[PDB]
Amino acid sequence: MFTINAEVRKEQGKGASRRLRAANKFPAIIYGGKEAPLAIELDHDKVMNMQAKAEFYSEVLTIVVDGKEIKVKAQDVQRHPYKPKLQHIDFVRA
Amino acid sequence: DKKSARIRRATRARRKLQELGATRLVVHRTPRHIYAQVIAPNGSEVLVAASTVEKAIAEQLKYTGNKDAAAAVGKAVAERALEKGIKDVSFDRSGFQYHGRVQALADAAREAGLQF
Amino acid sequence: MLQPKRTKFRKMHKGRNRGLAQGTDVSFGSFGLKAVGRGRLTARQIEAARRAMTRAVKRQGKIWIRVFPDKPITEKPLAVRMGKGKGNVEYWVALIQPGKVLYEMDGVPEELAREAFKLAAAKLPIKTTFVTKTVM
Amino acid sequence: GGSTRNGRDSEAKRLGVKRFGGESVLAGSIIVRQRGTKFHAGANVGCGRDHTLFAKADGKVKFEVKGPKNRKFISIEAE
Amino acid sequence: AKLHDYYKDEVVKKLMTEFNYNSVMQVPRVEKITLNMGVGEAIADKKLLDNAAADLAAISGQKPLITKARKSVAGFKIRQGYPIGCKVTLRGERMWEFFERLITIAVPRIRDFRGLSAKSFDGRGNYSMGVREQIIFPEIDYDKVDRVRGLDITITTTAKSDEEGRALLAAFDFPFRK
RNA sequence: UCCUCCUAAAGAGUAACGGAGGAGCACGAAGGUUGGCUAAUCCUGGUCGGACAUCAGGAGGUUAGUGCAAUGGCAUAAGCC
RNA sequence: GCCUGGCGGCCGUAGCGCGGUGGUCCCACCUGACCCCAUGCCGAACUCAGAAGUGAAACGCCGUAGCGCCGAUGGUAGUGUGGGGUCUCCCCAUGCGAGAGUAGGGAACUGCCAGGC
């Protein structure tokens, strides 16, 4: 069980995705739940310090974004080409 | 699939007719029936036809798969062709032989009027 | 000793390395090595590195190898001038880049590639080291 | 070694490309050694000994997307 | 030439009074024998079959024809268009006509005569009635010395299983073994 | 000297004793044309049968073949009857 | 309105597998053949004279998603144009960018005509 603070991600593309990763952030997404896809910004090393536990993937977690809070489940990951660091991650509505 | 071999022979013909466009006469038969239809110069619809389904033939013929029933359709489609004034009509045999009931239909269509 | 299957054609072209290509997910085991750099790897180097591990691991495992020689190289006499031409095949080589895992392990708990890799890294290019299994 | 030759001078390129003038006959596609990858459709045909889909009437090319999976035909437009 | 009359009266058809079949299209039917006679090493004789050209039509109710090979070089010698056999195939009335001599009078030579083994059974109940080599039937000029060749016969059925194809062995009698 | 696939750069000819090969002929038929046909390979079983032998069944198929080379295609068959 | 067939327009979200259902119009099997036509033998194939028997098979209709098929959104590889860093690679600014995978879809669409109930 976890609760994390997220922010709606409003600027997308390669150089912006690399910019986040230099400025303590990284891209992610929320989809499913019979609702439209949402793009989000997360803390780069602080979520990497969190996801290395089974209870991040075996059970739901809360995301706090857009002035509400919702439960999701972790769906997918992209790792760095030669490092365990987070490049991009997927979530699905729970 | 010996049924599909007749469809292959029809693909051969359909491709060969595709470069012609225009008004087309298609003949089709089965062990109890025979019919002939005139397809429009846009290919999208029929104009006129003749078929062993009409009680004008089907009540007078003792079997609709007969030679004289094929001639009855030939003599009807030629008569309806004269009503709609069709010329330069390309013939199509639906993958069948021309010999037999399609020839016996055509032989009588050129007896009810112009060739055909 | 490692001597790959005779090439369909008598000679090959060496080719350029892009110096990245992800391949970090272990599929012949659960753990492996860190590459994090780029260069050329030879058949004698991977057999000398296999010898270094064979001497420390005895017969445990085995260990699986995801790098194999890709090209034979043409070699000729040193005195031949510049111009004509390419010699016969001599040594076999491959290319390495940061995303490589090189070697894959699972059946060798804590006695290989868990505390150090220095003894096998001393036989190889690009100052390599071990990696821990990726589980999340 | 050597003597692989390949020889010299051969082309048959770029003649089946983009917007046409619609007032003389055109090759439509001159792709080498064509036997079934393309073929012809609609009002036009091409049966030349050099596998050219040359249309026998004056018109423009349709650049048609119809045809089964990876088999697409040389056809002339209606205007 | 009487089986044609009886095969239309009750043989594997009176079944339809006690079992759930509304037509003969769900019951066992027999209508074919794809006959052949091989030549073997005849290429090293090339003179006997040059005069015995109707010697298969002497037992089958159809027109004789020599079959030409589909092979042009072989480890036993063959040549392009060489005659490799004769068929004289039985269907319908000529098949029922031909069947009236099988097991009934084909007894001049035997090798088990109690049912051998159910080869080529196809899981349907396809029955063996071959003779390995011709045994000669009474017709005309059959009492003399004359040579004989290889002859094998399988009767194949439209049945779906040997559980239901065996309704033929419940209407006729012949020696059978699996 | 001629000829294919590739190098040759998502516009074209094209380099270096560049990469895999060929051509100086063949077939009056292996050409024209109407209608058809559909591999191969393997399994099953059938006297004379060393050993591949027959005719029929089953699996199965841009995998057979194409005068010759390399390449692209293939039943609307350009493959064979 | 639903059904059966055809000309098709279209031919990888009509495909593969799995479970039901139909003989009425239709079709397939099927009745018979030295008759028209036919087997390099065989009514198998293709005919011709057709309804005695079915819906076995093939065919049509319908359900069922494990999948071919369709497939977001984001990211990644890639990159045009400027520029950074002892530099055949890394890093950035600005403008573009897949394929594959994931969520998810999905057991065909549609115009004309004849007949059926």
Side-chain angles (χ1 to χ4, degrees), chain B residues 2-3 14 24 29-30 32-33 35 44 66 97 100:
Chain B
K2 77 171 188 178
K3 288 179 180 65
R14 286 169 179 150
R24 175 185 174 196
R29 64 169 168 75
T30 53
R32 188 160 59 103
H33 305 117
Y35 74 105
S44 305
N66 188 270
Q97 293 155 39

Side-chain angles (χ1 to χ4, degrees), chain A residues 27-47:
Chain A
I29 53 180
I30 307 177
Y31 52 70
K34 305 169 183 67
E35 288 183 279
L38 179 66
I40 52 158
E41 186 195 271
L42 289 176
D43 290 274
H44 188 214
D45 80 89
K46 299 186 192 181
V47 178

Side-chain angles (χ1 to χ4, degrees), chain A residues 6-82:
Chain A
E7 189 70 67
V8 183
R9 183 176 173 240
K10 297 160 194 171
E11 183 159 51
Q12 287 133 112
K14 187 176 176 186
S17 303
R18 294 180 177 201
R19 172 182 293 141
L20 290 178
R21 301 182 201 115
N24 77 251
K25 295 296 193 181
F26 77 118
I29 53 180
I30 307 177
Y31 52 70
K34 305 169 183 67
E35 288 183 279
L38 179 66
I40 52 158
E41 186 195 271
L42 289 176
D43 290 274
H44 188 214
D45 80 89
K46 299 186 192 181
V47 178
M48 187 56 194
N49 182 63
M50 187 183 285
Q51 75 81 245
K53 283 176 175 184
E55 60 171 297
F56 192 96
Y57 288 93
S58 66
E59 58 178 85
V60 298
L61 62 87
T62 305
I63 297 186
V64 186
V65 67
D66 194 47
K68 68 174 181 177
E69 53 176 77
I70 62 174
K71 283 175 166 174
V72 301
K73 55 188 175 193
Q75 177 58 12
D76 195 24
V77 61
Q78 296 187 13
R79 308 180 204 277
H80 181 282
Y82 64 90

Side-chain angles (χ1 to χ4, degrees), chain B:
Chain B
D1 187 63
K2 77 171 188 178
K3 288 179 180 65
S4 298
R6 201 181 80 207
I7 309 300
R8 186 272 187 77
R9 297 166 209 159
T11 307
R12 173 175 171 82
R14 286 169 179 150
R15 282 282 170 204
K16 193 65 177 184
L17 293 166
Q18 204 183 125
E19 70 153 320
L20 305 185
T23 308
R24 175 185 174 196
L25 171 57
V26 185
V27 187
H28 196 117
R29 64 169 168 75
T30 53
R32 188 160 59 103
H33 305 117
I34 184 163
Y35 74 105
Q37 51 160 341
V38 180
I39 287 63
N42 70 1
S44 305
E45 57 181 281
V46 72
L47 183 66
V48 290
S51 176
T52 50
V53 79
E54 289 180 56
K55 295 178 183 179
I57 301 176
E59 201 181 293
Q60 300 185 2
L61 275 289
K62 300 181 306 298
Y63 185 64
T64 50
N66 188 270
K67 185 182 174 184
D68 213 279
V73 173
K75 293 174 292 188
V77 75
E79 193 185 289
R80 294 174 184 169
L82 186 66
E83 203 188 290
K84 307 302 177 193
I86 65 179
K87 274 88 77 187
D88 193 7
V89 188
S90 296
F91 190 88
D92 184 31
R93 71 186 184 283
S94 311
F96 293 89
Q97 293 155 39
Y98 175 67
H99 207 319
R101 281 194 288 142
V102 178
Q103 178 174 252
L105 181 156
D107 183 75
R110 69 183 58 122
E111 196 185 298
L114 176 62
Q115 287 78 5
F116 287 81

Side-chain angles (χ1 to χ4, degrees), chain E residues 107-122:
Chain E
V107 305
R109 183 163 170 58
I110 59 169
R111 305 181 176 74
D112 175 90
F113 202 68
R114 296 189 299 156
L116 194 70
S117 184
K119 295 194 180 199
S120 310
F121 196 67
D122 200 33

